[PDB]
Fold Photoswitchable protein Tetdron.
Amino acid sequence: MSVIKPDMKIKLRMEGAVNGHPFAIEGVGLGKPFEGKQSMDLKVKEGGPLPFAYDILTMAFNRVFAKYPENIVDYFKQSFPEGYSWERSMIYEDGGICNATNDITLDGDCYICEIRFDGVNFPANGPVMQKRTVKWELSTEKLYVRDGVLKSDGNYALSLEGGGHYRCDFKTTYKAKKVVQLPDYHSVDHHIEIISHDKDYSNVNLHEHAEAHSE
């Protein structure tokens, strides 16, 4: 509790590859852990202009920024100052698959995030490589306990240019770096949005709003 403040800073770096194309992105941000809101400025440092849709990256760019009611255990605010890491697979319906990890530490009032992101098998004719995505729809993450850690699933969808949706299945494992109380089964609704961007998304402002529920 005492380590989590109403306003806290974010620093992150992402390294990765999509279809073998390497890149690196750094971010600085700000968030309100109790109101479940955060914003960040992201700059592509290497591998730009990115030849794939930026939207496959945005949910990789921290569940401490989610509004939790008093009747649901908060795995994430419990884990600090030591922090926690996660592991995630994102399986798109045309066979592209992204794996990603994130190690989250706290230094003072600033979350430090190291992200590895690796996607493969995106077809050259598909919405990702041709940059035909518009936005993520509202995403409901379902969290449950297995083997003493916290897992989650999600059936998410990107709306496309010209209509229709592009489905992706998310599978996440969360691992706190210290012993914490484990929550019951519950949900978190996420709204993610690219607020601003330049010509080739070398500069992007990203916003997220997340709230937890269980009834």
Notes: The radius of gyration is 17 Å. Residues 75-79 form the longest helix (5 residues). The first strand starts at residue 8 and ends at 18.
